[PDB]
Curated annotation (Swiss-Prot), chain A:
Assembly and interaction partners: Component of the Integrator complex, composed of core subunits INTS1, INTS2, INTS3, INTS4, INTS5, INTS6, INTS7, INTS8, INTS9/RC74, INTS10, INTS11/CPSF3L, INTS12, INTS13, INTS14 and INTS15. The core complex associates with protein phosphatase 2A subunits PPP2CA and PPP2R1A, to form the Integrator-PP2A (INTAC) complex. INTS9 is part of the RNA endonuclease subcomplex, composed of INTS4, INTS9, INTS11 and inositol hexakisphosphate (InsP6). Interacts with WDR73; interaction is required for the assembly of the RNA endonuclease subcomplex in the cytoplasm.
Entry function: Component of the integrator complex, a multiprotein complex that terminates RNA polymerase II (Pol II) transcription in the promoter-proximal region of genes.
Additional observations: Although strongly related to RNA-specific endonuclease proteins, it lacks the HXHXDH motif that binds zinc and participates in the catalytic center. Its function as endonuclease is therefore unsure.
Protein name per its UniProtKB record: Integrator complex subunit 9
Family: Belongs to the metallo-beta-lactamase superfamily. RNA-metabolizing metallo-beta-lactamase-like family. INTS9 subfamily.
Location in the cell: Nucleus; Cytoplasm
Disulfide bond positions: none
Coiled-coil regions listed in the entry: none
Organism: Homo sapiens
Swiss-Prot record, chain B:
Protein name: Integrator complex subunit 7
Lineage, top ranks: Eukaryota, Metazoa, Chordata, Craniata, Vertebrata
UniProt key word RNA-binding: no
Family statement drawn from the similarity comment of this UniProt entry: Belongs to the Integrator subunit 7 family.
Keywords: Chromosome, Cytoplasm, DNA damage, Nucleus, Phosphoprotein
Pfam families noted in UniProt: INTS7_C, INTS7_HB, INTS7_N
GO biological process: cellular response to ionizing radiation; DNA damage checkpoint signaling; regulation of transcription elongation by RNA polymerase II; RNA polymerase II transcription initiation surveillance; snRNA 3'-end processing; snRNA processing
Subunit field text: Component of the Integrator complex, composed of core subunits INTS1, INTS2, INTS3, INTS4, INTS5, INTS6, INTS7, INTS8, INTS9/RC74, INTS10, INTS11/CPSF3L, INTS12, INTS13, INTS14 and INTS15. The core complex associates with protein phosphatase 2A subunits PPP2CA and PPP2R1A, to form the Integrator-PP2A (INTAC) complex. Interacts with NABP2.
Acetylation is among the record's keywords: no
Domain of life of the native organism: Eukaryota
Length: 94, 901
């Protein structure tokens, strides 16, 4: 549920940690974005769209934390949008 | 070798013999005094506890004695619960003497266990027991718990009320149990119930014994609970007035004495009327002395100002006439108390229709004096003390009487014994010290008195010569004549002790007559039987020589200024070489060496300044290149700024680092620092930026305390130099020669007023030191404490204060400022962890927790500084300046991670 407890006496370096809100402004993600954000040995893996990558690192620059913009999106793109529109063609498009 | 004493004495404790165990137990308080740190204290107290648990009831009394003696170390015990359990495991025994001893131990331990419930239950259970030693120990422990706990106070209030007026438990036990009611001030209604019970007791048992005990209890309740002290003062006035017994009256006297010492602002006008009226119609004389002693202690405070308050003629007031017929009384002590009262009325509030009493006052003193001069008894000596203190205070408050004061004193300096010459010479010394204009009015008369001492007795002779030559030095405010030097000299060649001449020499060095200081220091130099005392006397001789060279100056003559300054520097340098040779590890003379060194630096600042003023007459206007500062003289006086400002800072550093001197030595250091600021301001107002001065001394230049003649002449010189600076502000060219002449006259004016070696140069009264046992691991010497360079270092500095004597005589330690810093010793340098913490000691202990962040790679240097904060607020920079070494290691996994990254 939180760092406040069982995470203190079970934590194991190195790890894979999944943290709080991806906007990088509130949660437990700010704590691990600090502390560990001092060495180039570690990396942070941004995976979620609709939040700007460079804007999230903006309060945290200057910074030595390795960063890879690896966004995973499942929403349909413009090719299948065209397929959808030529499949079930409407009278109007908004 | 800290715990080794513990193992030695506890090896003594594991004997099977009672004697060796008792010896170790009674040897524990010395070990407590030697190392006061709570690790040793806690360990030794637990060992005392489990020796107390199993014992043959005589070891128990010894451990009780040790606990009674070492009361101030009781708050340092860490494992309190185990200690108290081991002690408390004896209440459930069946030997009544052992139980009584254990309740006495609980009463001693009361401070650390105020709210332990089983202790209160044991006190209540054993309090109504039938074994007398158990009962007495229970009353002791109930008195000691009742001073701190409140629920215990109310329950024992009910219980002791019942057992006092239970009509069993005979009168000796009632006398023992009334102080339980004394300690019973915790709550308002509790105090009121105790007050009603005490009033019922004092009207119910009208004896000599119970009335005395109940009245002392009742007044301690009143002086503890400040809600109705005037009611008890009132009740004491009826007990002192309407009671035929005598011992009750004597307690009323000592009671009103305590209450007037404690809370004098609550004394109402009709209370003083009642006390005075009861002091009139008493037939006895000891009672008269007691009441007027109470009124004398009441006269030294603001109770008189409440008494003589507007909204009757104060001549018709009871106090002043009572003071008159007890000032003109036959007995000496009542006369001393009365003349104290009259002097205190005179020094206090200034209404017009009291001034006639002034005349009466001064005549009273001399009348009393001629009664107490020719008696030679310790009571008459105390009467001399009281009379002369009144003389000093009377001359101090009203200066226009003072001249008459001093001349009367000289009359009784003609005809009195060898014990009355002293302390009258001291009174003359004080009066001629702060108020100097009368001192010369003695002059020569003391000469002939001093001549009489050529053929006086021998027992009190040396102190008497010391007193007479001291008041000679004080009275000679301008200088001493050559014939005066000759007569003093030939008299102490006639007879002297050798230490008497040392006291005279240091008195002369104090006042400023350095030529007789030279001669007596020569006399000491031929004398004396040790190395460093010889070097010390040689140094003092050289200082006196340089100061006579400084007295040989002439105004508006710069040639003699350079010559005499050079002579003063060479004699001071022989003296500072002698002082450096005189320094010892046992007595590391630090104030004297620093004071002399900064005096040398002040005179060399003066020498560079005077020859720099000569440089304008010894160089061009500037150069052919310069045609808003031009010339080398501007750079030279900028260097004068640097030197004088640094010198003022060093005077401030000497002020802050002493803390053990008196007011006079500190004020002299302030005089030297103010001289440095004076010269700095004078130069930076004349030549270096006149433009941004714009002040013209907008502060007060008058109405000074003037506690010494040297202070007054310093202040006069300061005001004259500032007047010259204000006048010569922005009229003339920036270089000028009126500016250089102003600096020259300022230097001459500072060096004309000689010097004053004060008390801390010779004798040290207060000695305070701090320990600061650093315990991260304390190391050894060059071995550093290893840190892992991923965690901080818990320093855990702990300290204790050591007092030489009379704990705090002049200033008292309120809080102590510990500062810590680091330094990278590998070669800012690790200023990132400068830390500060304030400590309030409990009795003597300092306990703080310091975390130091060692982050980079290297060996670091932890320095710890102390700083005492006093009651007024001035910070004092003493301390051991403790340094310790750390090495920063790294985790091999972290090293491999950093190498891979």
């Amino acid at each position: 549920p939180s760092i406040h407890g069982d995470f203190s006496n079970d934590f194991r370096q190195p790890c894979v940690v999944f943290t709080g809100h991806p906007s990088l402004r509130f949660g437990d993600v700010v704590h691990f974005m600090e502390l560990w954000g001092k060495s180039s040995l570690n990396t942070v893996i941004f995976t979620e769209p609709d939040f700007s990558y460079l804007e999230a690192l903006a309060p945290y620059q200057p910074l030595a934390m390795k960063c890879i913009y690896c966004p995973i999106d499942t929403r349909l793109n413009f090719i299948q949008v065209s397929k959808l529109l030529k499949e079930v063609q409407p009278l109007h498009v908004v | 070798d800290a715990n080794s004493a513990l193992m030695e004495l506890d090896k003594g404790l594991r004997s099977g013999k009672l004697g060796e165990q008792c010896e170790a137990v009674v040897r524990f308080p010395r070990l407590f005094q030697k190392y006061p740190f709570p690790i040793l204290i806690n360990s030794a107290f637990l060992k005392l506890a489990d020796v107390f648990r199993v014992g043959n009831n005589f070891l128990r009394l010894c451990v009780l004695k040790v606990t009674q003696q070492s009361e101030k170390h009781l708050e340092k015990i860490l494992n309190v619960d185990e200690f108290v359990k081991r002690i408390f495991s004896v209440i459930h025994s069946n030997d009544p003497v052992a139980r009584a001893i254990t309740l006495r131990m609980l009463g001693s331990l009361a401070s650390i266990i105020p709210e332990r419930k089983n202790a209160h239950h044991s006190i209540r259970q054993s309090l109504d027991s039938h074994d007398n030693v158990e009962v007495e120990a229970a009353v002791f422990a109930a008195a000691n718990f009742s001073a701190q706990s409140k629920d215990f106070a109310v329950g024992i209030c009910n219980k002791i009320s019942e057992m006092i007026q239970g009509l069993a438990t005979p009168v000796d036990l009632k006398l023992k149990l009334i102080p339980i009611l004394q300690h019973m001030h915790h709550d308002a209604i509790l105090a009121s119930s105790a007050r009603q019970l005490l009033q019922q007791l004092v009207t119910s048992y009208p004896s000599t014994k119970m009335v005395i005990v109940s009245l002392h209890t009742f007044t301690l309740l009143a002086a503890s609970s400040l809600v109705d002290t005037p009611k008890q003062i009132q009740l004491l006035l009826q007990y002192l007035k309407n009671d035929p017994r005598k011992a009750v009256k004597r307690l009323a006297i000592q009671d009103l004495k305590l209450l007037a010492n404690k809370t004098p602002h609550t004394w109402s006008r009709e209370n003083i009327q009642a006390l005075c009226e009861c002091a009139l119609q008493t037939p006895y004389d000891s009672l008269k002395l007691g009441m007027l002693s109470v009124l004398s202690t009441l006269s030294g405070t603001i109770a008189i100002k409440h008494y003589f308050s507007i909204v009757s003629s104060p001549r018709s007031s009871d106090l002043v006439k009572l003071a008159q017929e007890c000032c003109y009384h036959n007995n000496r002590g009542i006369a001393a108390h009365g003349v104290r009262v009259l002097t205190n009325i005179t020094v206090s509030c200034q209404e017009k229709d009291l001034l006639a009493l002034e005349q009466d006052a001064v005549f009273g003193l001399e009348s009393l004096l001629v009664l107490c001069s020719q008696d030679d008894s310790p009571g008459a000596q105390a009467t001399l003390k009281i009379a002369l203190n009144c003389m000093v205070k009377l001359a101090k408050g009203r200066p226009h009487l003072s001249q008459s004061v001093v001349e009367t004193l000289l009359t009784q300096l003609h005809s009195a014994q060898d014990a009355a010459r002293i302390l009258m010479c001291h009174c003359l010394a004080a009066i001629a010290m702060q108020l100097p204009v009368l001192g010369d009015g003695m002059l020569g008369d003391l000469m002939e008195l001093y001549k009489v001492i050529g053929r006086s007795a021998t027992d009190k002779q040396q102190e008497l010569l010391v007193s007479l030559a001291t008041v000679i030095f004080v009275a000679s405010q301008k200088a001493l004549s050559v014939e005066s030097k000759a007569v003093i000299k030939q008299q102490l060649e006639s007879v002297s002790n050798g230490w008497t001449v040392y006291r005279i020499a240091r008195q002369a060095s104090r006042m400023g007559n350095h030529d007789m200081a030279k001669e007596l220091y020569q006399s000491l130099l031929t004398q004396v039987a040790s190395e460093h005392f010889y070097f010390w006397l040689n140094s003092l001789k050289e200082f006196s020589h340089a100061e006579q060279c400084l007295t040989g100056l002439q105004e508006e003559n710069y040639s003699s200024a350079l010559s005499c300054i050079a002579e003063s520097l060479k004699f001071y340098h022989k003296g500072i070489a002698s002082l450096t040779a005189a320094s010892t590890p046992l007595n590391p003379l630090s104030f004297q060496c620093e004071f002399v060194k900064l005096r040398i630096d002040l005179l060399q600042a003066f020498s560079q300044l005077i020859c720099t003023c000569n440089s304008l007459k010894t160089s061009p206007p500037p150069a052919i290149a310069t045609t808003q500062r031009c010339g080398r003289i501007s750079n030279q006086m900028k260097q004068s700024m640097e030197e004088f400002r640094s010198l003022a800072s060093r005077y401030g550093d000497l002020y802050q680092a002493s803390f053990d001197a008196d007011s006079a030595t500190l004020r002299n250091v302030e005089l030297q620092q103010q001289s440095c600021l004076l010269i700095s301001h004078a130069i930076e107002a004349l030549i270096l930026d006149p433009e941004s001065a714009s002040f013209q001394e907008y502060g007060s230049t008058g109405t000074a305390h003037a506690d010494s003649e040297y202070e007054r002449r310093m202040m006069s010189v300061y005001n004259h130099v500032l007047e010259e600076v204000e006048s010569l502000n922005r009229k003339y060219t920036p270089v000028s020669y009126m500016h250089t002449a102003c600096l020259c006259n300022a230097i001459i004016a500072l060096l004309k007023v000689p010097l004053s070696f004060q008390r801390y140069f010779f004798q040290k009264l207060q000695s305070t030191s701090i320990k600061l046992a650093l315990s991260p691991s304390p190391r050894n010497p060059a071995e550093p404490i290893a840190v892992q360079n991923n965690q901080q270092l818990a320093l855990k500095v702990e300290g204790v204060v050591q007092h030489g004597s009379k704990p705090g005589l002049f200033r008292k330690i309120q809080s102590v400022c510990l500062n810590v810093s680091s330094t990278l010793q590998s070669k800012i340098d690790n200023m990132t962890n400068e830390m500060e913490q304030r400590v309030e000691p409990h009795n003597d202990y300092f306990s703080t927790q310091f975390l130091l962040n060692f982050a980079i790679l290297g060996t670091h240097n932890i320095t710890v500084e102390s700083s005492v904060k006093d009651a007024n607020g001035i910070v004092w920079k003493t301390g051991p300046r403790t340094t310790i070494f750390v090495k920063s290691l790294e985790d091999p996994y972290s090293q491999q991670i950093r190498l891979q990254q």
